[PDB]
Design a protein around this ligand. Structure first.
Ligand code: A1AIG
Ligand code: A1AIG
Lengths: 238, 38, 247, 289, 247, 289, 38, 49, 50, 38
């Protein structure tokens, strides 16, 4: 009963037959900005179903040497569909996200993915005094790969990452993970091109294994922005 | 003892015993029962 | 005027004192409060979250390999698979955990711990394990027939992926100390051991070796006392760019 | 559900179970929830009335103790030939330079607090004649204000900056700084860039900029030189905290970033945080009699 | 007597402290209060008064010439006439204004600005302008078709001499900083630009070149925070006759 | 109309307009009124409940911080051969000598306030043996009273003048001076002449004369010389303020007048207050990516 | 805390939130409407 | 566009609803397939994993 | 402020004084009390034993 | 006078005049009478 889930948002739907409940980060749900928390006084555009829909990113191959993958929000979506166009035309943005992570394999496969949403995942570089550059951080839709997932690329640890909102994909048990993220920021809105509220991370704590004939085992990421608001209409930065 | 005019001057507020650990231990949309989880 | 006299302790700077002090910016208005997800108010909320034990803290396990234990099919009955040292003060599998790192800011602790293990073999892998807690007083048990006499859960693999062994708070004193003397009667917790109850049994097309991930958390009977500087961090030098803050 | 918790929970006695369909020790870690198995479900318990308080792990108590954030030594002397802090220094206020307070603060993503500041001053004679009772001035110079260039510049007249004047023979000088972020909370971590171009700093939220602390000796120099050392302590108070984080494991490299190297070998090496034992079957401090 | 102890901060002179202190002239009677016109009680009353922008801050504009912009008839459509930098912290057209000079005693600011332009051509001069505010994030717009996408007023010259462009408070944070880093995301406001909507059209006996005066004020949603010494004044020397105060 | 304002105003949501005869963005600057266009009239707005306080821009808060008004150094020594402040000085009280406080005060035409006075003293050995703990006397000498001629003159017996005696090892000495103008407010600016003849001073209202501050060391000289520096701070309090003024742009030249020269080039040159840009079409810090 | 006999000795009076900006923004004998000014 | 992500499992079948998205009340069965009164658009299937 | 003056005996350490003093460990919770046999409250109880 | 927040900071508690010397002088199961003891 908590293994089958349908998510419907706008013109998009996802069904899964092997979920493991789903996470609402910190027990929150996305909502629009109330008047008692507003700063910017222009009337916001609320595009609803034009933006509040699943976008599916390029799938990555899970391979025996894989260190894990990450995608930054809103950056990974800033160039996609009508969400991206509103990002490019507006100074200010606010939304939640619905994250659905997909990975199926046979009953003869084994492997476990930690699927974790990290708020303000400020990265470190390895073995240098120089801070990470713009091109190290801003990957867009492709996302990045972990250099040292064991310290989360930030001198910290993977083992304690379960303090952040997460599920697991354990190929024995489930083929999908779902995390619902509220707006997570100190300011009520932000400029979407220079700050990321959330990093999705997928780390293979138990590596992919089988003795059947090998197949490509992709991991697929689908993300729906939720309750998108935009303020400060301008030309496109683009 | 606070004779200063600004309330941020005051001593520390060590009295908030409210907790909600379930926002970190149980952020599941459907709560666990005592009962096969899945 | 008022007749007064000064007591001992007049003019000291105690770093744990609690007084009002002079506001440097009069009439300042702080930014209005906004609701943010995830407010923490007591650090006991954090240690109740489960986090991965570094059970495979061995040479030749590198990075993430240290967070999993590999299980194989055996040909002898009732074999020992692994054990877990329970000293939070000494550098063992429990140290780099949420319960571990927070507790090391404190000196005294009380209450129960939960260990959960997730089996990450294939769907076709089967097996039963026994997980045993031994209260302190003797050596760590090396045979299943000895370990079986302590607190234990027998674990059958199945659709539910995980079991918990509760480590109950069994103590003479109200608290234990995070004592560098691990053999101290005020500090030693005893042992956790895992044996094969039956065997790991897999078909030819499943991987012959399967992994456990182990987690630990505090329960809500858990309490911490006597705050201290944590031994997990230190510096011998100025950090880079620290000097440049003065330039 | 939110509730008031002042003491650790009681234990109820429990009996034998043997119920079909009820398996409280089985769990599903893949959901992301932590195990809900109670001790009464796992073993036979007695009743325990638990009286242990939980006040010492309050975030207010955990964070609100005074910690060193700045330490600076300079020469109090005739500086006419020096290259140097010429009887004064400027400090760009930060909380990342001393690792004990830094690591505790970095257990959280967002923090809102007022800062109690204590300034401790000490003096030694340069390589003896007694120690002078100097007057010092500390001046808070916010963003966009002019900092002093000299010990005797007119910036020190402090028409609108907050200054505190204090003696070495006094108790340590103390002021509270209000929570002064332009947001509702400080960003302890910031996954972003400070400017609208691409060349701005990574990892520093512009919203959290405090400003500068400028400290001079107010006395004219003496015929002999002294070393003055200033120590600044911060104590957070009236604290709110959000989104707890995994703790720092590797040594810090820099105040400007989260860069990491690790120790050359375990513990806290990049390949191995916990020190090694011989095998997963080895009990390192095993009791033997 | 009363047992007491001294705290940290005893005996300090904090320049922003607020205490009673000993009256040097006992039984003094101050002069009775008299009503005077123009009492100010909050400095936000002053910044709400509009004052002239130095928009023509260019070499070869001398003195009063810097307070006016000259407009001429053009022969190309939709041309840019001028733009206005919006940094109050950096030395631009906004600095030497009532809102400007008062705000520079503070570090944080929030709320809306009004710009008003008065057309000072002849009665016979006609024309339409478009005044555009661009929220920050990109470069200042150089073409009317780009600027038109921001907040704008189209202004027809007529019997009413002046239009206001409201600059609404569009900000992620509650406040902005008067930051010497003008490109900082906590400080940059964006741009104002003026284009020809139609043309300046004049008869032969009117002057072919006409002037705009631009003004700015805060609205009553405006707020200032964190008082500081203003960078607009300083001295390197004693003033003249200052020494003679001691002689 | 007078009203109590504690927070900045709320914004109401607004719709599309299209009304004939209604043009809220048009204004008439020639009337002398400032534009009354509201943001709700200029653009479509949302509702914003505004919580920002306005206390920090209160005239009381803006002015009532302590600022340096007098600084004097003199020799504490045997003066039998000197030409000099011979262990004491006289100061003709004024508020125009230090530009930070002067410029803030000169934002107003009329001010009524009481003056909190703080006196900070510091000592150095002349070109070391330790620093002596001297007693000083500050004596307020009003208009028409006799000022001291010598460190040991009988004027210092202070039968009716207010004197404060204070040590260097004390906290700074503090007194409040009442608002003591013979009018209801001080004249910050005075478009007039002080006397009935034509030769009196321009720009000083005789009504605002405070008097003299005379400061001596009370100790007899030591066998060795010291430099003593006295700093006087004033803090206005219980302030009323009338008729706000355009701020000072050009550097001050003199304490006696408003004379002006400007800097040699912009900013704050007489020909150009704002620094130059290349053209009215040049955006000086334009964002480029 | 003021034990001094003269009221001018007291601490500062930071409580007067009365404003009337219209004496500086709108000293026009006939008030503006929301409406051609002239 | 409008899409369903389909996971194989115990339930063998998914439906993609093709909603009636049309400017006019009706479409024509027109031999001109590119006619704006007739064209419906497309269905496509991709690998999700 | 409050006008005050210091008396003789200001700043002395008398070993038999009785004052409150600053708690070095804020929010500390002492171990719950347990009944123990043989509480003594007055030393005159001890000298009455032969 | 105790303005500290923790009650262990307080001055000494010199007010407990309760005694029971018989737990040390007379721990006999059957009490003595005024009367041959044995
Ligand atoms: C001269 C006198 C009158 O005024 C003074 C004013 C200030 C000081 C002083 O040293 N202040 C401080 C030192 C170190 C850090 C801070 C922070 C802070 C930094 N970061 N954060 C967010 C965190 F924690 F999340 F990172 C908060 C905030 C305010 N002040 C600070 C000393 C004196
Ligand atoms: C010796 C002790 C017992 O008595 C003392 C008495 C006085 C002082 C001292 O230094 N007082 C002062 C120093 C500087 C200025 C003033 C003003 C003032 C000047 N101008 N204005 C109008 C303005 F602002 F509009 F210009 C107000 C008024 C009263 N006192 C002043 C020190 C000590």
């Amino acid at each position: 009963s908590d293994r089958v889930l349908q998510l419907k948002l706008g013109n998009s739907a996802i069904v899964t037959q092997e979920a493991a409940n789903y996470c609402c980060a910190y027990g929150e749900w996305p909502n629009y900005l109330p008047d008692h928390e507003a700063v910017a006084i222009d009337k916001p555009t609320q595009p609803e179903t034009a933006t509040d829909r699943f976008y599916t990113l390029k799938s990555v191959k899970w391979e025996t040497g894989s260190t894990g993958w990450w995608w930054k929000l809103p950056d990974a979506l800033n160039n996609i569909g009508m969400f991206g166009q509103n990002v490019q035309h507006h100074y200010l943005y606010r939304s939640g996200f619905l994250i659905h992570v997909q990975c199926n394999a046979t009953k003869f496969h084994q492997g476990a993915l930690l699927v974790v949403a990290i708020p303000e995942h400020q990265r470190g570089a390895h073995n240098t005094n120089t801070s990470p550059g713009f091109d190290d951080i801003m990957k867009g839709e492709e996302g990045g790969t972990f250099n040292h997932p064991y310290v989360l690329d930030d001198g910290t640890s993977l083992a304690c990452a379960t303090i952040f909102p997460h599920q697991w994909i354990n190929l024995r048990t489930n083929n999908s993970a779902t995390i619902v993220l509220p707006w997570m920021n100190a300011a009520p809105m932000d400029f979407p091109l220079r700050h990321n509220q959330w990093t999705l991370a997928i780390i293979p704590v138990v590596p992919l294994g089988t003795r059947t004939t090998s197949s490509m085992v992709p991991i697929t990421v689908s993300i729906a922005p939720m309750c998108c608001e935009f303020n400060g209409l301008r030309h496109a930065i683009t | 003892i606070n004779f200063y005019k600004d309330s941020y001057a005051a001593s520390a507020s060590k009295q908030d015993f409210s907790q909600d650990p379930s926002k970190f231990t149980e952020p599941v949309v459907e709560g666990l029962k005592a009962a096969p989880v899945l | 005027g008022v007749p007064t006299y000064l007591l001992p302790g007049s003019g000291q700077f105690l770093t744990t004192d609690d007084h009002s002090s002079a506001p440097a910016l009069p009439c300042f208005n702080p930014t209005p409060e906004m609701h943010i997800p995830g407010q923490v108010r007591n650090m006991l909320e954090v240690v109740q979250v489960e986090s991965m034990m570094e059970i495979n803290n061995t040479e030749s396990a590198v990075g993430m390999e240290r967070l999993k234990v590999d299980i194989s099919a055996l040909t002898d009955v009732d074999q020992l698979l692994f054990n877990i040292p329970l000293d939070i003060q000494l550098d063992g599998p429990l140290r780099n955990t949420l319960v571990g790192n927070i507790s090391r800011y404190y000196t005294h602790w009380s209450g129960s711990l939960e260990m959960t293990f997730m089996f990450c073999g294939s769907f076709m892998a089967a097996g039963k394990l026994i997980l045993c807690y031994t209260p302190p007083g003797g050596s760590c048990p090396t045979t299943r027939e000895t370990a079986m006499l302590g607190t234990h859960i027998v674990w059958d693999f199945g659709l539910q992926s995980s079991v918990t062994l509760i480590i109950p708070w069994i103590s003479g004193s109200h608290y234990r100390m995070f004592n560098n003397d691990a053999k101290s009667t005020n500090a030693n917790v005893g042992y956790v051991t895992c044996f094969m109850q039956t065997n790991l049994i897999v078909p030819s097309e499943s991987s012959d070796t399967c992994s456990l991930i182990g987690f630990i958390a505090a329960k809500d009977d858990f309490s911490l006392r006597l705050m201290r500087d944590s031994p997990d961090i230190g510096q011998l030098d100025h950090l880079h760019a620290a000097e440049a803050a003065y330039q | 559900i939110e509730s008031i918790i002042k003491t650790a929970t009681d234990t109820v006695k429990s009996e034998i179970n043997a119920e079909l369909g009820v398996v409280p020790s089985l769990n599903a870690v893949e959901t992301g929830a932590t195990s809900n198995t109670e001790p009464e479900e796992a073993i036979q318990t007695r009743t325990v009335i638990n009286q242990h308080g939980v006040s010492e792990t309050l975030v207010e108590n955990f964070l609100s103790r005074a910690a060193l954030v700045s330490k600076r030594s300079f020469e109090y002397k005739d500086h006419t030939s020096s290259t140097a802090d010429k009887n004064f220094f400027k400090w760009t206020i930060n909380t990342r330079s001393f690792v004990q307070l830094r690591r505790k603060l970095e257990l959280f993503t967002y923090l809102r607090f007022d800062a109690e500041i204590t300034i401790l001053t000490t003096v030694a004679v340069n390589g003896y004649v007694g120690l002078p009772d100097l007057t010092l001035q500390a001046m808070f110079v916010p963003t966009g204000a002019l900092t002093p260039e000299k010990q005797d510049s007119f910036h020190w007249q402090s028409g609108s900056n907050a200054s505190v004047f204090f003696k070495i023979s006094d108790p340590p000088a103390r002021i509270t700084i209000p929570f002064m972020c332009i947001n509702s909370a400080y960003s302890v971590f910031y996954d972003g860039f400070a400017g609208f171009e691409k060349n701005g700093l990574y990892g520093i939220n512009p919203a959290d900029t405090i400003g500068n602390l400028c400290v001079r000796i107010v006395n004219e120099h003496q015929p002999v030189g002294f070393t003055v050392t200033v120590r600044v302590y911060m104590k957070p108070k009236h604290i709110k905290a959000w989104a707890p984080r995994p703790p720092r494991t590797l040594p810090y490299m820099s105040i400007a970033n989260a860069n990491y190297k690790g120790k050359e070998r375990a513990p806290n090496a990049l390949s191995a945080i916990i020190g090694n034992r011989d095998s997963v079957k080895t009990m390192p401090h095993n009791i033997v009699n």
